[PDB]
Structure 1
Amino acid sequence: PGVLKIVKVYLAVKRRIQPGDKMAGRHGNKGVISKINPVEDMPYDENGQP
Protein backbone atom coordinates (compact mmCIF):
# COMPACT_ATOMS: atom_id res chain seq x y z
CA PRO A 1 0.00 0.00 0.00
CA GLY A 2 1.15 3.48 -0.95
CA VAL A 3 3.58 2.15 -3.58
CA LEU A 4 2.95 3.53 -7.06
CA LYS A 5 5.82 1.98 -9.02
CA ILE A 6 8.86 -0.25 -8.51
CA VAL A 7 11.89 -0.43 -10.80
CA LYS A 8 14.41 -3.23 -10.23
CA VAL A 9 17.86 -3.08 -11.83
CA TYR A 10 20.23 -6.06 -11.93
CA LEU A 11 23.97 -5.36 -12.04
CA ALA A 12 26.60 -7.91 -13.03
CA VAL A 13 29.99 -7.31 -11.39
CA LYS A 14 33.16 -9.19 -12.33
CA ARG A 15 35.27 -9.55 -9.20
CA ARG A 16 38.93 -10.50 -9.66
CA ILE A 17 41.22 -11.98 -7.03
CA GLN A 18 43.06 -9.39 -4.96
CA PRO A 19 44.96 -9.14 -1.67
CA GLY A 20 42.54 -9.65 1.20
CA ASP A 21 40.51 -12.42 -0.43
CA LYS A 22 40.12 -15.71 1.43
CA MET A 23 41.31 -18.90 -0.24
CA ALA A 24 41.17 -22.46 1.05
CA GLY A 25 41.61 -26.10 0.16
CA ARG A 26 39.59 -29.04 1.44
CA HIS A 27 41.72 -29.79 4.52
CA GLY A 28 41.13 -26.70 6.65
CA ASN A 29 44.06 -24.87 5.03
CA LYS A 30 42.55 -21.39 4.82
CA GLY A 31 44.31 -18.10 4.28
CA VAL A 32 44.27 -14.59 2.91
CA ILE A 33 46.13 -13.43 -0.19
CA SER A 34 48.99 -11.12 0.76
CA LYS A 35 50.61 -10.24 -2.57
CA ILE A 36 50.04 -10.68 -6.30
CA ASN A 37 53.57 -11.56 -7.40
CA PRO A 38 54.96 -10.97 -10.90
CA VAL A 39 55.63 -14.14 -12.87
CA GLU A 40 59.36 -13.43 -13.17
CA ASP A 41 59.64 -13.32 -9.36
CA MET A 42 58.06 -16.62 -8.64
CA PRO A 43 59.92 -19.89 -8.05
CA TYR A 44 60.36 -21.96 -11.19
CA ASP A 45 61.60 -25.42 -12.11
CA GLU A 46 64.33 -26.57 -14.50
CA ASN A 47 61.87 -26.35 -17.41
CA GLY A 48 61.07 -22.69 -16.71
CA GLN A 49 57.57 -23.31 -15.37
CA PRO A 50 56.73 -21.00 -12.45
Structure 2
Amino acid sequence: AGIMKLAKVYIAKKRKLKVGDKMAGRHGNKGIVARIVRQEDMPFLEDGT
Protein backbone atom coordinates (compact mmCIF):
# COMPACT_ATOMS: atom_id res chain seq x y z
CA ALA A 1 0.00 0.00 0.00
CA GLY A 2 0.98 3.60 -0.64
CA ILE A 3 2.83 2.81 -3.90
CA MET A 4 1.10 3.10 -7.26
CA LYS A 5 3.53 1.41 -9.65
CA LEU A 6 6.62 -0.80 -9.36
CA ALA A 7 9.14 -0.77 -12.21
CA LYS A 8 11.87 -3.43 -12.25
CA VAL A 9 14.78 -3.65 -14.69
CA TYR A 10 17.07 -6.69 -14.79
CA ILE A 11 20.58 -6.17 -16.16
CA ALA A 12 22.98 -8.98 -17.07
CA LYS A 13 26.74 -8.51 -16.71
CA LYS A 14 28.99 -10.87 -18.67
CA ARG A 15 32.13 -10.90 -16.53
CA LYS A 16 35.16 -12.60 -18.06
CA LEU A 17 38.24 -13.44 -16.03
CA LYS A 18 40.47 -10.39 -15.60
CA VAL A 19 43.42 -9.26 -13.51
CA GLY A 20 42.33 -8.81 -9.92
CA ASP A 21 39.73 -11.58 -9.95
CA LYS A 22 40.03 -14.16 -7.18
CA MET A 23 40.60 -17.84 -7.96
CA ALA A 24 40.89 -20.80 -5.63
CA GLY A 25 41.27 -24.56 -5.54
CA ARG A 26 39.61 -27.08 -3.26
CA HIS A 27 42.63 -27.38 -0.92
CA GLY A 28 42.72 -23.96 0.71
CA ASN A 29 44.86 -22.46 -2.07
CA LYS A 30 43.58 -19.03 -3.09
CA GLY A 31 45.03 -16.25 -5.18
CA ILE A 32 44.48 -13.13 -7.24
CA VAL A 33 45.05 -13.21 -11.00
CA ALA A 34 48.14 -11.01 -11.25
CA ARG A 35 48.84 -11.35 -14.98
CA ILE A 36 47.07 -12.63 -18.09
CA VAL A 37 49.98 -14.09 -20.06
CA ARG A 38 49.95 -14.81 -23.79
CA GLN A 39 50.10 -18.35 -25.14
CA GLU A 40 53.61 -17.97 -26.56
CA ASP A 41 55.01 -16.65 -23.26
CA MET A 42 53.66 -19.57 -21.20
CA PRO A 43 55.79 -22.55 -20.17
CA PHE A 44 55.28 -25.36 -22.66
CA LEU A 45 56.11 -29.05 -22.81
CA GLU A 46 58.10 -30.99 -25.40
CA ASP A 47 54.96 -31.30 -27.55
CA GLY A 48 54.57 -27.51 -27.65
CA THR A 49 51.34 -27.29 -25.64
Moved over 3 A (4+): none
Partner residue, 1:9: 9
Q: How far apart in 2 are the matches of 1:6 and 1:26?
A: 43
Partner residue, 1:41: 41
Q: How far apart in 1 are the matches of 2:30 and 2:16?
A: 18
In structure 1, the gaps of 5 or more residues are none
Using the TM superposition, give the Cα deviation of residue 25 of structure 1 relative to its aligned residue in structure 2, in angstroms. 0.4
In structure 2, the gaps of 5 or more residues are none
Partner residue, 1:24: 24
Identity, in percent, stands at 55
Q: Number of aligned residue pairs: give it.
A: 49
Secondary structure, in 3 states, of the residue corresponding to 2:40?
helix
The two structures have a TM-score, normalised by structure 1, of 0.89
What's the Cα RMSD here? 0.8
The two structures have a TM-score, normalised by structure 2, of 0.91
